[PDB]
Amino acid sequence: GELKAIAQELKAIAYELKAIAKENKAIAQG
Amino acid sequence: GELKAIAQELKAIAYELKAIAKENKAIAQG
Amino acid sequence: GELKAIAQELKAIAYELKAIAKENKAIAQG
Amino acid sequence: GELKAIAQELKAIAYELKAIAKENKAIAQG
Amino acid sequence: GELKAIAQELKAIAYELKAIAKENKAIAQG
Amino acid sequence: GELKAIAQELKAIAYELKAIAKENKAIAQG
């Protein structure tokens, strides 16, 4: 149901934030 | 209902974060 | 209802992320 | 109630994102 | 309860976003 | 329960934001 769908989307959000963290570290280092 | 609305907005949020990840990747590439 | 209120704030969050993506792209293209 | 508390925290999150959008716009300008 | 746990995590999230807004403001002002 | 799952994903989100805050501070001061 929709509570699972909500959890799944939060999982996708975490994945994108992890990607942003990675790029911003690269920006800090460069 | 409203739980689906919440799921759909989280989907939109993930989508915008994907876009930020992309632009930051470009910024990190100089 | 508060569930609708939650959905509405998530829509606002998506909107602000969209704006952030827009500015970061401009930084990128700049 | 806790659902209202969640809505309120989301409102605080939207406010901080709006602040970030404003600063990134400033960065883009400069 | 878990609804309280959710509110508490959102509070932590708002806190981190406030930290990011602070740093981006500093970047903007330079 | 899915409510616990949601709380746990929000915890992971707070973790990633903490990392972004750290990197943006380095960008600011670096």
Q: Which residues contact D20 (CB under 8 A, 6 or more apart)?
A: C16, C20, E17, E20, E21, E24
Report the candidate in D3, C7, C14, C12 with the shortest Cα–Cα distance to residue B2: C7
How distant is the Cα of D25 from the closest Cα of chain C, in angstroms? 5
The structure was resolved to a resolution in Å of: 1.6
Which technique was the structure solved with, according to the deposited record? X-ray
Length of chain E: 30
Chain B: closest CA distance from residue C26 (Å): 9
**Spatial separation of the C-alpha atoms in residues F28 and E27, rounded to whole Å:** 5
Taking residue C13's Cβ as centre, other Cβ atoms within 10 Å add up to: 22
Is chain A adjacent to chain D, meaning 3+ CB pairs within 8 angstroms?
A: no
- With 0-12 CB in 10 A as exposed, 13-18 as middle and 19+ as buried, what is E1? exposed
Please give the Cα distance from D24 to F15 (Å, whole number).
22
Structure tokens, D18? 């709006």
The count of CB pairs under 8 A between chains E and F is 50
Question: Of D6, D17, D29, which to mutate for an interface test with C (greatest number of C Cβ within 10 Å)?
Answer: D17
